[PDB]
């Protein structure tokens, strides 16, 4: 996690020398493991378009 | 805030406004849910009853996008004390549920390791509010922001007259005339990372305002994200 924190898009954590990436609530971990991708409308510290 | 810029359309849609009986502003607050509102201990003992308001920008002509909450349950800190300022924290839990809408919108709660690690050593973060633009100044009309470096540990320990605790860090400048001021209490200290911003700091004092030698002094979220939890279930 100490590298670009581990790619990750948000959380990281070291579980057995391997990077778990997690989100804050409101937002889904993507299939990639480390994207997080927002699981509706207006998601936490997002500034707003619309 | 001292110096700092105005808030744009949908650039600060967490900032929460305490507003009295008179319906004026006198601290601020940050949107953690739909029914969670993250403030100051101290703002509390600052007036009788208030009621919320979110969506803001100017509080002076009437937008449409604003909307006043009344708060169902207050949650001090019991260890908070005028006396050192420690423990400067509440929350509060509303009647109805925030419509998040443009310009209304929760920052994120971060966990406490990584937020430690990865957020608070950041260079800086974002502190916004309603509050008064000079030291001796009037409560602002519009909403601002401003973008306050992480300040030394150690480096603003010597600089204070009082003692910082542990619940305690400083953000802003030595001697550049920015800050947060009386009126932003209360407020977001929110840091950006990947363009997401997540709740660090509420804003708590400071030995006036933009003054030389001083910083802006903020409850540390990461401090109270097990006591934040509990105030939300509960
Ligand atoms: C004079 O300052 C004026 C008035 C007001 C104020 O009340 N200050 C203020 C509060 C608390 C303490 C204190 C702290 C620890 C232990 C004991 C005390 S004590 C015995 O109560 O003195 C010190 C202080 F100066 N102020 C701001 O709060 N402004 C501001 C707020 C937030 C930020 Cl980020 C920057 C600026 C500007
Ligand atoms: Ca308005
Ligand atoms: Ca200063």
């Given at each position: 996690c100490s590298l670009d924190n581990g790619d990750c898009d948000q959380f990281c954590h070291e579980e057995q020398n391997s990077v778990v990436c997690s989100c804050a609530r409101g937002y889904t971990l993507a299939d990639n493991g480390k994207a997080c991708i927002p699981?509706?409308?207006?998601?936490?510290g997002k500034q707003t378009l619309e | 805030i001292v110096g700092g810029q105005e808030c744009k359309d949908?650039?600060?849609?967490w900032q929460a406004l305490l507003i009295n009986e008179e319906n004026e502003g006198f601290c601020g607050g940050t949107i953690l849910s739909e029914f969670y509102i993250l403030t100051a201990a101290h703002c509390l003992y600052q007036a009788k009853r208030f009621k919320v308001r979110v969506?803001?920008?100017?509080?002076?002509?009437?937008?449409?996008?604003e909307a006043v909450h009344e708060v169902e349950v207050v949650i001090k800190?019991?260890?908070?004390?005028?006396?050192?300022?420690?423990?400067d924290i509440a929350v509060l839990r509303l009647k109805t549920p925030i419509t998040f809408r443009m310009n209304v919108a929760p920052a994120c709660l971060p966990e406490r390791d990584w937020a430690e690690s990865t957020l608070m050593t950041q260079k800086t973060g974002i502190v916004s509010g309603f509050?008064?633009?000079?030291?001796?100044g009037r409560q602002s009309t519009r909403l601002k922001m401003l973008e306050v470096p992480y300040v030394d540990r150690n480096s603003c320990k010597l600089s204070s007259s009082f003692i910082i605790t542990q619940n305690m860090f400083c953000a802003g400048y030595?001697?550049?005339?920015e800050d947060a001021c009386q009126?932003?209490?209360?407020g977001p200290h929110v840091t950006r990372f990947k363009d997401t911003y997540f709740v660090t700091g509420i804003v708590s004092w400071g030995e006036?305002?933009?003054?030389?030698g001083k910083y802006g002094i903020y409850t540390k979220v990461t401090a109270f994200l097990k006591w934040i939890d509990r105030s939300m279930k509960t």
């Open positions: 699981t509706g409308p207006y998601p936490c | 949908g650039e600060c849609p969506g803001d920008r100017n509080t002076e002509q009437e937008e449409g996008g800190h019991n260890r908070f004390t005028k006396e050192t300022y420690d423990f509050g008064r633009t000079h030291e001796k030595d001697t550049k005339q009126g932003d209490s209360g006036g305002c933009a003054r030389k």
